[PDB]
């Protein structure tokens, strides 16, 4: 089986799993949308209102596709969905991991120029170590995130659901720290009372901070910003291996014949839906499998890399 898509299954699996791509009409939210063309890239299935189609649902005006993913490892409910983790990919090129140097699959590929690859085990280690060391980055736009292990520029993870690989409790911890860091970046302060840790936004005028809020929102402690003790009077004192990194690069480590008429067809981006430009055959086939186009190929690998 070839799997283009990986999701985080928050359901029974509690891990990264191969996923199934599905499409519906964005208006009626029914599986009644016939796409104009198949998706060819991640952008096509992640950004709303990018792909067009005809809805077959009676009297529905919808012409827009809404893509969603489901875990493919467990028998899914109709309503449930799982977040797509676009950085993750089957390691078909057998690239080594930047940390452990082993060949593993699936792998996460950073969006740095080097396209550094790391196994999910080592990515988890990276995340856990950085979270404890308060080494996560606060971006005013991207939120609380990490770049590539090797520190490559413009590599901060944008899809923050990648951090679910931490596990449920550690993810919650990641989100708490993100909110805490966000508060501090907003010029606010955290209540210093043990068992509180409230997020408070006072003014730079008033350095008289009271933990305001009832029914569990505040504790009521009045503190001074500097010392983080009870309101004072006036002013009172009281490592990435070089060779491992080089080998762990996605890229730095055309046409295909029709299965029926052997006449060469050129691919359309990443879309695996192939239609033969030969009037006597015109077969619809999968670039990957070489079988006739079907719903299994759509769910598993509608598009790739």
């Amino acid at each position: 089986i070839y799997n283009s898509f990986y999701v985080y299954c928050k359901g029974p699996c509690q891990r990264v799993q191969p996923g199934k791509l599905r499409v519906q009409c964005s208006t009626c939210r029914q599986a009644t949308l016939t796409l104009t063309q198949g998706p060819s890239c991640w952008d096509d299935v992640l950004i709303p209102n990018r792909m067009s189609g005809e809805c077959q649902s009676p009297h529905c005006p919808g012409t827009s596709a809404e893509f969603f993913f489901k875990c493919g490892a467990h028998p899914t409910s109709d309503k449930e969905t799982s977040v797509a983790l676009h950085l993750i990919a089957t390691n078909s090129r057998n690239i080594t991991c930047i940390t452990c140097t082993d060949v593993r699959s699936p792998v996460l590929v950073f969006q740095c120029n080097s396209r550094h690859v790391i196994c999910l085990d080592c990515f988890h280690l990276y995340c856990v170590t950085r979270l404890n060391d308060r080494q996560f980055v606060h971006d005013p736009q991207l939120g609380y995130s990490l770049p590539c292990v090797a520190g490559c520029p413009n590599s901060l993870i944008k899809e923050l659901h990648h951090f679910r690989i931490l596990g449920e409790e550690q993810y919650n911890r990641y989100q708490q720290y993100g909110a805490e860091e966000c508060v501090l970046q907003m010029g606010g302060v955290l209540c210093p009372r043990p068992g509180c840790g409230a997020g408070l936004l006072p003014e730079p005028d008033q350095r008289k901070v009271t933990c305001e809020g009832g029914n569990g929102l505040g504790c009521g402690f009045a503190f001074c910003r500097e010392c983080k003790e009870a309101y004072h009077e006036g002013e009172c004192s009281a490592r990435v291996d070089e060779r491992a990194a080089e080998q762990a690069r996605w890229e730095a480590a055309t046409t295909k014949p029709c299965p029926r008429c052997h006449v060469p067809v050129e691919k359309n981006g990443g879309c695996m839906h192939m239609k033969c430009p030969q009037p006597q055959c015109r077969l619809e086939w999968c670039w990957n499998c070489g079988c006739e186009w079907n719903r299994v190929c759509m769910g598993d690998h509608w598009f790739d890399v």
């Binding site: 928050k10 709303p48 449930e80 969905t81 799982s82 977040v83 606060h138 971006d139 736009q141 991207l142 939120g143 609380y144 995130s145 899809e159 923050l160 659901h161 951090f163 919650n172 990641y174 989100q175 708490q176 720290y177 993100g178 909110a179 805490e180 860091e181 966000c182 508060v183 907003m186 606010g188 955290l190 509180c196 840790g197 409230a198 997020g199 408070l200 936004l201 305001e212 809020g213 029914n215 569990g216 929102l217 505040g218 504790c219």
Partner: protein, 73 residues
């Protein structure tokens, strides 16, 4: 159609039902309707990102059961 949790840094959780197409402002109204906090004093944060009142939960790709952090202004 989607259940989410609104959590203070203190650890108080507020369960709220939302439509993924609902604006963040509508989320703040639901917090008022059950905790009495005026929307104007609410700051919602998701995964370290301060949320835009005019954006939707679907813009943040929030799924059922996920947590938004509430901070008082």
């Amino acid at each position: 159609s989607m259940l989410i949790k609104v959590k203070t840094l203190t650890g108080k959780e507020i369960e709220i039902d939302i439509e993924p197409t609902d604006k963040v402002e509508r989320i703040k109204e639901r917090v008022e309707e059950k905790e009495g906090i005026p929307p104007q004093q609410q700051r919602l944060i998701y995964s370290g990102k301060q949320m835009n009142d005019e954006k939707t939960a679907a813009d943040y790709k929030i799924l059922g059961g996920s947590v938004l952090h509430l901070v008082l202004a």
